[PDB]
Design a protein around this ligand. Structure first.
Ligand SMILES: C=CCC[C@@H](O)CO
Ligand SMILES: C=CCC[C@H](O)CO
Ligand SMILES: [Ca+2]
Length: 240
């Protein structure tokens, strides 16, 4: 997250860190959202490669022991059937991971709330992006969980020539674009928490940003719209 501030360690309990084994050590690669004690929602492009993955819940500081972490392996990866690695702009950047074990819920580990199917947020709705991703374009990962205010930018506008144009679809949500705050490499798969009816629900899964840079004016961060996949999500967790 570029232009963010450290989050209180118990503000976003559904946030998880997706990591892969590099030889003998583990490295953070993406974010994700705990939606079931044994299910995690993330971006399909985060699990495109065939590597060994593990999920960490109740995490705050990646390099320090917080005394609240839970490490669990991933036994099943269900990528959306229409996902195409070479065409992220086509959408469908979403995947579901069945964890090898059910995590224990507590003050630092909670389930994220999903929106009602087909829900569209009004332009400029209040949302927050969270993650341990790059704090600067071509920079380095954040040690502590970062958060940033990132209001939505509706489709009509986001798909206009002055913004993303035809690269953005109605199955995506755009947020930010003030040239100061944004998601960045390492935040992918993470949540876009939006305040609706006095409650924060996960309306997006971080998908991509501009090739020019992370924080670019008129180039908001693009997210997979969760409300457009509610049926698919339930169908998967119902038969797996
Ligand atoms: C926050 C998303 C970064 C994803 C990049 O790979 C796209 O340029
Ligand atoms: C296992 C801890 C996460 C490591 C990070 O990717 C950077 O050191
Ligand atoms: Ca830690």
């Amino acid at each position: 997250v570029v232009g963010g501030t450290e989050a209180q360690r118990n503000s976003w309990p559904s946030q998880i860190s997706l990591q892969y084994r590099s030889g003998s050590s583990w490295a953070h690669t993406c974010g994700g959202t705990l939606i079931r004690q044994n299910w995690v929602m993330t971006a399909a492009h985060c699990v495109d490669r065939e590597l060994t993955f593990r999920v960490v819940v109740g995490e705050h500081n990646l390099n320090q022991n917080n005394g609240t972490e839970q490490y669990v392996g991933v036994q099943k990866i269900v990528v959306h059937p229409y996902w195409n690695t070479d065409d992220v702009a086509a959408g469908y950047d979403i995947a579901l991971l069945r964890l090898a074990q059910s995590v224990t819920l507590n003050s630092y580990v909670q389930l994220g709330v999903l929106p009602r199917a087909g829900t569209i947020l009004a332009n400029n709705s209040p949302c927050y992006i969270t993650g341990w991703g790059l704090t600067r374009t071509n920079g380095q990962l954040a040690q502590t969980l970062q958060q940033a205010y990132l209001p939505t930018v509706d489709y009509a506008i986001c798909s206009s020539s002055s913004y993303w144009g035809s690269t953005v679809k109605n199955s995506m949500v755009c947020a930010g674009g003030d040239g100061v705050r944004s998601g960045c490499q390492g935040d992918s798969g993470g949540p876009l928490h939006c305040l609706v009816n006095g409650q924060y629900a996960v309306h997006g899964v971080t998908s991509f940003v501009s090739r020019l840079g992370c924080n670019v004016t008129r180039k908001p961060t693009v997210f997979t719209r969760v409300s457009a996949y509610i049926s698919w999500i339930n169908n998967v967790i119902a038969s797996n």
